[PDB]
């Protein structure tokens, strides 16, 4: 009914990096904050710089999930798995039904800005969005987050989000944990 805030993302995956804390593998993961997400591109150089530290610095946790917002329009998700550093995979979920060239473009830009070839991206299947696609890519967070803690993550199909429910519902009651 209402759209998704980058502080809601934020305040959710803050609340799931709780969750998870201790878990077999959650020291892997790293739920990058959307406004840093979008400061990659920022015409501020020490802006960019800032982003490129807190995204892609020497202490960053190799599995990283970036929100990309399209301002007061979309969202979408890339996730960027460098624990290969000669195999870097990464990998963009936009949950719109007609898809429109500038959110695959914001996820280039932002690939581009972490130092990786955009062109490698996979455009991957995710639950099709029936103002939720706020919801569809913090419920891909929250799975896929999962799969690398069980250690299914990595199978073929591992990846794969074309099943997900995502639930106004328990965003909101997870929300109301803060």
Same mark, same amino acid.
């Given at each position: 009914t209402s759209w998704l805030l980058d502080g809601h993302l934020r305040a959710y995956t803050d609340d799931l990096a709780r969750r998870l804390r !201790?878990?077999?593998? #959650?020291? $892997? $993961?790293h739920f990058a904050d959307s406004q840093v997400v979008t400061m990659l +591109? +920022? #015409?501020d150089p020490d802006q960019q710089a800032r982003a490129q530290r807190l995204l #892609?610095? =020497?202490?960053?946790?190799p599995i990283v999930f970036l929100p990309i917002n399209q301002p007061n329009a979309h969202w979408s998700l890339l996730v960027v798995d460098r624990r290969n550093k000669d195999a870097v995979a990464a990998y963009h979920y936009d949950s719109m039904a007609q898809k429109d060239p500038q959110q695959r473009y914001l996820a280039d830009m932002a690939a581009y800005h972490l !130092?990786?070839?955009? @062109? @490698? /991206?996979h455009e991957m299947p995710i639950a099709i969005q029936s103002y939720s696609a706020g919801d569809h890519v913090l419920t891909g967070i929250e799975v896929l987050a999962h799969r690398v803690l069980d250690g299914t993550?990595?199978?073929? !199909? !591992?990846?794969? $989000? /074309? =099943?997900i429910e995502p639930d106004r519902g328990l965003i909101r009651d997870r929300l109301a944990q803060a």
């Open positions: !201790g878990e077999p593998n #959650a020291h $892997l $993961l +591109s +920022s #015409a #892609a610095g =020497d202490d960053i946790p !130092g990786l070839d955009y @062109q @490698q /991206t993550f990595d199978y073929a !199909g !591992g990846r794969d $989000l /074309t =099943d």
